[PDB]
């Protein structure tokens with residue numbers, strides 16, 4: 001089968017199993033893929049989305065260790081454009097509307113989030129060893 | 134170059150960049166390796182070492198996403214023995230003494246820990262957004 005270029009993007013702050021499963025899902029959308037992962041900038045993430053603990057460099061360095069990741073664009077653009085897909089020869093965007101154009105182009109592929117497995121969920125579990133009273 | 138079987142073991146609780154760098158180091162000890170990673174049991178870790186947030190199954194599932202990991206033994210034995218090295222055809226043990234026999238056998242390879250990159254370090258950074266006064 002021909003190689004298919006998949007693009008996923010995100011913050012990837014305090015990388016956890018939920019991120020890695022979503023990256024696995026994107027990587028496995030077809031038999032033979034290149035998974036490019038875009039990591040959002042510190043300034044744009046904080047302005048448009050919310051707070052981020054780790055710097056772009058830290059978030060990117062951690063992602064390089066994930067086996068599903070073939071290429072990283074860091075920083076990535078905050079908004080995906082058709083020209084961006086042309087520049088990097090991206091066939092499909094893997095995502096969990098602003099995205100109507102992607103669906104009309106046949107380039108939108110859904111991925112799922114996993115609940116209850118985040119890094120902050122783990123800290124909440126640590127805290128339960130300390131009773132309120 | 135002939136394939137070399139490397140064994141590393143650990144708790145791998147709330148997997149972070151420091152773990153992944155140490156696994157990368159073990160994987161890259163020689164040109165061609167198989168990196169087997171042993172994950173310690175919940176009961177033995179808590180008895181002999183200290184507290185663990187994630188279950189063996191969770192710690193193991195997260196490790197499978199790391200690109201350096203070729204095989205996982207989960208649970209692994211708490212203490213490595215010469216018979217264990219024979220059973221899994223392990224050439225070297227990558228570790229950061231109880232381990233004198235490994236050094237005498239020529240099978241001890243040192244790896245390093247990275248400071249300041251742990252999951253709990255990140256939570257400490259979150260807390261600094263809240264002044265004492």
Ligand SMILES: NCc1ccnc(N)c1
Nearest residue numbers: 056057058060061074075
């Ligand atoms: N590894 C690429 C990258 C991303 C962000 N900041 C850097 N200094 C480098």
Ligand SMILES: NCc1ccnc(N)c1
Nearest residue numbers: 189190191193194207208
């Ligand atoms: N994936 C192996 C494994 C380790 C611990 N517990 C399980 N149920 C399974």
